[PDB]
Ligand SMILES: Cc1cn([C@H]2C[C@H](OP(=O)(O)O)[C@@H](COP(=O)(O)O)O2)c(=O)[nH]c1=O
């Protein structure tokens with residue numbers, strides 16, 4: 001896979017963010033994860049975690065997987081990086097996202113993220129407390 005440039009337009013919630021990619025505004029949905037909705041338990045904490053990570057980054061990048069690059073709602077589907085650190089992984093590692101929505105052929109980082117979930121669960125963090 002390849003990292004590509006993007007810039008933050010606006011944080012949205014734990015697993016979606018609005019970015020400018022190739023000069024166009026897009027909502028991105030993070031691959032392979034599910035955060036609680038803002039209205040649910042840990043939702044506000046997941047939103048705040050992803051907001052801080054993307055707002056504090058000097059450099060945002062997106063990395064598309066091998067399959068679909070957009071979903072049925074027109075959201076980009078990607079791995080997002082903040083100063084080199086994967087947001088999708090970091091939210092799972094802190095127990096603020098579950099591994100989810102693992103579709104065949106857009107699942108390059110599945111094992112990396114399942115290892116992060118196992119660690120968060122062993123630590124009883126957040127969702128796993
Ligand atoms: C993450 C992901 C979500 N989606 C779709 C499945 C779900 O459809 P439904 O809306 O019909 O439930 C929705 C979940 O996104 P949210 O968790 O952002 O609600 O997005 C994909 O199609 N591909 C993906 O990789």
Ligand SMILES: [Ca+2]
Nearest residue numbers: 015034035036
């Ligand atoms: Ca969600």
